[PDB]
Ligand binder design. Structure first.
Ligand SMILES: COc1ccc(S(=O)(=O)N(CC(C)C)C[C@@H](O)[C@H](Cc2ccccc2)NC(=O)O[C@H]2CO[C@H]3O[C@@H]4OCC[C@@H]4[C@H]32)cc1
Lengths: 99, 99
């Protein structure tokens, strides 16, 4: 699609089996969900943001489906106030910003 | 332009007479700059993101040039680690996300 920005650009995403919703966020380098069920051990990772830095759980080689694209990526689980799809995932589906 | 997302999508903008750089940020509701001096009246605002809240000054109906277009609208000013162009500003130049 071609998405205008009059509202927050939420998209449907299937992440490691579960249908979730998340914000396409071009100012985010990383993809981060709050409370998804992902199998197994995770590695600790730090992530920054406007307010300071958070400890998050890093899960690798997680399948992510957006708009019909199946991709495999790194998914963080952490106390973000909204699920975000970052540039790491958006590059894998060929997303561009256009003006 | 058509921008891929392999690197942070910075753009040149002119604001308060100064050339600045800022992220085209679809996850940002508003535009936020650090260390810029604007002339009008401001009102206090708090915004929140990853790692918590940020106190900012809200300046309304402010002129900003982005690429070559004169956009008049809200600009927040506060100690963010990176300047960001938010959706309110980007909608006025017809910016879209495509994939
Ligand atoms: C109401 O108006 C607002 C309100 C909030 C914000 S924001 O900056 O907090 N943010 C909201 C979003 C988290 C829901 C916009 C994001 O695009 C910020 C924009 C941002 C970028 C850098 C630093 C601070 C903020 N990016 C961000 O927090 O990214 C996180 C996750 O991935 C990492 O990539 C980034 O780069 C490395 C660290 C951050 C990490 C902006 C305008």
């Amino acid at each position: 699609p071609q998405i205008t920005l009059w509202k927050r650009p939420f998209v449907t995403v299937k992440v490691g089996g579960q249908l979730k919703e998340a914000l396409l966020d071009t100012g985010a380098d990383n993809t981060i969900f709050e409370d998804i069920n992902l199998p197994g051990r995770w590695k600790p990772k730090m992530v920054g943001g406007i307010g300071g830095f958070l400890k998050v759980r890093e899960y690798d080689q997680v399948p992510i489906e957006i708009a019909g694209h199946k991709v495999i990526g790194t998914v963080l689980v952490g106390p973000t106030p909204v699920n975000v799809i970052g540039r790491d995932t958006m590059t894998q589906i060929g997303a561009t910003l256009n003006f």
